[PDB]
Amino acid sequence: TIHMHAYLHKESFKKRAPKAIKIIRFLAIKTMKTHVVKFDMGLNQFIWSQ
RNA sequence: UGAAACUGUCCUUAGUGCAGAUCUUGGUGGUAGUAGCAAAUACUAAGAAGAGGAAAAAAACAUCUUAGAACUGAAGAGGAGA
C-alpha cells in the first residue's frame, strides 16, 4: 500500500496524476530491481478517476 | 609545398607602395555553450510500426489505434463562402 498523500502533498495541481504514475514506477524499480515496469490499464484508470 | 611559365641590366610609360577615412567588399573572433527555446488550463496507460527508451531512474520518448482525463462551449478552436 502506497501512502500517496506523502508524495503528493502540496504538489502542483496539474502534475498530481502524472506524478502519481512516476512515483509508482520508482517504487517498482526500487523493489523488483527491474527497469521495465508495465502498468495495468485498470491501475491507470483508477489514478485518473478523480 | 607547388607543376608552366619566368628573371637580371638600361631607357620609356603609369590606374605604382596603405594602419586609420562610422572607409568599400568578403571572411572570422571574444561575448558564448552565455541570454534565451516560460501567453493560448493537459496529459496518462496498453498495443502497432520504426535504427530510433535506452538505464546504476538516462524521472522526459515524435506518429497511429483503444481506454481514461480534458479544452473551444455553439456571436465556437464547428460547418461553409467573398
Side-chain angles (χ1 to χ4, degrees):
Chain A
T1 155
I2 296 129
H3 179 200
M4 197 76 70
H5 194 202
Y7 302 110
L8 303 182
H9 156 88
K10 254 176 135 207
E11 175 69 21
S12 300
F13 282 147
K14 284 301 184 342
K15 304 134 98 171
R16 292 252 181 150
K19 199 207 174 182
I21 296 276
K22 276 171 148 210
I23 283 291
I24 297 172
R25 204 191 316 266
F26 178 62
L27 292 188
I29 279 173
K30 290 308 245 191
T31 325
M32 309 322 209
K33 319 288 189 186
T34 65
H35 261 277
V36 180
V37 172
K38 269 169 203 146
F39 282 62
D40 186 27
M41 281 295 258
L43 179 52
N44 176 59
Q45 290 187 197
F46 171 73
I47 279 273
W48 285 86
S49 52
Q50 322 273 77

